[PDB]
Amino acid sequence: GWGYGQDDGPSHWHKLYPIAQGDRQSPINIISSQAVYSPSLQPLELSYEACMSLSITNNGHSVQVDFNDSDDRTVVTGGPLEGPYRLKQFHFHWGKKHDVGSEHTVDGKSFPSELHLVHWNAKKYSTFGEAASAPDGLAVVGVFLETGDEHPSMNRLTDALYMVRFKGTKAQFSCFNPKSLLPASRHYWTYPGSLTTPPLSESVTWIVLREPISISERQMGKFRSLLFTSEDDERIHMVNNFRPPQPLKGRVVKASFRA
Numbered sequence: 001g002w003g004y005g006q007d008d009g010p011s012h013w014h015k016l017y018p019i020a021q022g023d024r025q026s027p028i029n030i031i032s033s034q035a036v037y038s039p040s041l042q043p044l045e046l047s048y049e050a051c052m053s054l055s056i057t058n059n060g061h062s063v064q065v066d067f068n069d070s071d072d073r074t075v076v077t078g079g080p081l082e083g084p085y086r087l088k089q090f091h092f093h094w095g096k097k098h099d100v101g102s103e104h105t106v107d108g109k110s111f112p113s114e115l116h117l118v119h120w121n122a123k124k125y126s127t128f129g130e131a132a133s134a135p136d137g138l139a140v141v142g143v144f145l146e147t148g149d150e151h152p153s154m155n156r157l158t159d160a161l162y163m164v165r166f167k168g169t170k171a172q173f174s175c176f177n178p179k180s181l182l183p184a185s186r187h188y189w190t191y192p193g194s195l196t197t198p199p200l201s202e203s204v205t206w207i208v209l210r211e212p213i214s215i216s217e218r219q220m221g222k223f224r225s226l227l228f229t230s231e232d233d234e235r236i237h238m239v240n241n242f243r244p245p246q247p248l249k250g251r252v253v254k255a256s257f258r259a
């Protein structure tokens, strides 16, 4: 139904999911000088266990690592959140070249990729699916990826990409700690937004980290080697699987730091 191709891409999603034109859509272009410094915000804590990862999957839209979310062991708390949100999965958005790929932009600048750690309010909702539709249901932490030096921990993930190159394939992926993909700073920007893929529900509290992590061009290349297509189809590489910035519509972006 929807994708990132010329005929089914982001520019057309609004024809199938009208909420695409809503007042709290994501991603956005963060104008750093206009963010409101908010010291009242609590410190952001990403408390992640080392062995809660289950599998790695090419779902045709991105490569996603799923987690055991039966308890509150791997959660995000603090910052703009009232309580803990359990990590359900993480995935990425990337481009064909370095100048494009991320969903959020900062002062008009795009990064080659963006990592999304998707968490849900298990204290209020009974399931991730139920939470994905409520205003306070999800908390997504976004981390920008820049290309430069090789990222040691990333190797375990980029080396596994071959096994899920085709759409609809998956592999076991145990003991990968998502903390290894975080920068050494916990400063962030936060604003009320939405899922960046259909159904585009406005159920996400976005927490976009200020500091990007870096991976090598070789590692980035492993993502670009993935395919939107299945085994016996004409190969179309999975690239530019991102939604562009949406209207802010008067929302206020808060910052945990002074720029």
Ligand SMILES: NS(=O)(=O)c1ccc(C(=O)N2CCN(C(=O)c3ccccc3Cl)CC2)cc1
Binding pocket: 116, 118, 128, 129, 130, 132, 133, 140, 194, 195, 196, 197, 198, 199
């Ligand atoms: N790019 S992003 O905003 O970080 C992001 C994060 C999470 C999701 C995602 O996992 N889903 C799948 C589940 N979603 C649903 O609306 C849903 C709920 C119940 C039954 C089926 C579905 Cl599709 C919401 C989208 C999709 C996109």
Ligand SMILES: [Zn+2]
Binding pocket: 091, 092, 093, 116, 196
């Ligand atoms: Zn995403």
